[PDB]
Amino acid sequence: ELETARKQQQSLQPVALSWEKYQKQERQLADWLTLESLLPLWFAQQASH
């Protein structure tokens, strides 16, 4: 029983790391997409000035 519990923990460990990496990637991509949407207005203000 103890051996199988430890084996299950070992097998599950990489999944959490991959999920954390995926969260990082997703939020970085979301930030860059938001900046893509916001790009026109910065240049518009600088052009106005």
End-to-end CA gap in the chain: 71
Resolved by: cryo-EM
Strands (E), 1-49: none
Amino acid at 18: S
Question: In angstroms, rounded to a whole number, what is the distance separating the alpha carbons of residues 49 and 44?
Answer: 9
Question: In angstroms, rounded to a whole number, what is the distance separating the alpha carbons of residues 9 and 7?
Answer: 5
Could you give the C-alpha distances from 37 to 27, 29, 34, 40, 49, in angstroms and in order? Answer: 15, 12, 5, 7, 21
Residue 4 host element (H or E): helix 2-48
Resolution (A): 3.2
Q: Cβ neighbours of residue 37 under 8 Å, at least 6 residues apart?
A: none
Question: In angstroms, rounded to a whole number, what is the distance separating the alpha carbons of residues 34 and 12?
Answer: 33
